[PDB]
Amino acid sequence: MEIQLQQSGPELVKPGASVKISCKASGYSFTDYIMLWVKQSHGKSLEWIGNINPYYGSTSYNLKFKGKATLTVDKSSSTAYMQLNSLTSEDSAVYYCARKNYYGSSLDYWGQGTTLTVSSAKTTGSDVVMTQTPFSLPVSLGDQASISCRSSQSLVHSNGNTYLHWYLQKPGQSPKLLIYKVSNRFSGVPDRFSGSGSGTDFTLKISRVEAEDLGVYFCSQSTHVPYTFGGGTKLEIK
Ligand SMILES: CO[C@H]1O[C@H](CO)[C@@H](O)[C@H](O)[C@@H]1O
Ligand SMILES: [Mg+2]
Ligand SMILES: [Mg+2]
Ligand SMILES: [Mg+2]
Ligand SMILES: [Mg+2]
Secondary structure, three states: OOOEEEEOOOEEEOOOOOEEEEEEEEOOOHHHOEEEEEEEOOOOOOEEEEEEEOOOOEEEEOOOOEOOEEEEEEHHHOEEEEEEOOOOHHHOOEEEEEEEOOOOOOEEEEOOOEEEEEOOOOOOOOOOOEEEEOOEEEEOOOOOEEEEEEEOOOOEOOOOOEOEEEEEEOOOOOEEEEEEOOOEEOOOOOOOEEEEEEOOEEEEEEOOOOHHHOEEEEEEEOOOOOOEEOOOEEEEEO
16 A cells, blocks of 8 residues: 555447446545546557546546546445446557546646547547647657646746646556646656746656666646646656
8 A cells, every 4th residue: 555546347338328436545544635537548548437436426527538438436335436428449549547636736646547448449829839840750769858838828837837747658557646836846856857948838857768768758737727738758768
């Protein structure tokens, strides 16, 4: 128990059917942290589905998923749920659940993810934009990487803090928090990583790229609602 979010297993369902993915929490006070859900279609970026306050059962969705996904919580068990209705081939993705803290309003803990396959086969406006540049970054190891992230609006908050974070997602893995609030390294994150920038400009730099660092980097803003993610920047070797 060190903060674990264990989601239910793979799903193969029939179109028009419903599924109900689960996220069992442990290692922390379930009721003291907001649970947020994310959708990631193959090769696509992260889509905020919506979040729930396990404490009240209060929710807020991404206009896009409202009426489609239903978030619930079972306090007596520290398990949060997301139900999907009228399933479509388009809902075939990998869904994640993640805890969002308050001090940095970043997603510090993610579940392993739940792959959903919708099929009849029986075996397998005003939202803030985040633009990541470049799309892909080929390097030779020991090389220095420098990724940039730009938002359509300033990300400074009334409190004087800027909620821009960097997540890293290694192949087949769940994304993970690297840097929160522009330049703070998350726990266990090496010093070769270092964020910077202000208002609308932000850059992630990796002085020395290493095999453990390859994967896709996502910046995300949360000083505005909804929460948005950059398209992602893939770091791979030549
Ligand atoms: C939910 O509490 C958070 O509200 C907004 C996001 O909605 C954040 O930017 C702010 O810093 C607070 O930590
Ligand atoms: Mg709503
Ligand atoms: Mg509202
Ligand atoms: Mg503060
Ligand atoms: Mg204030």
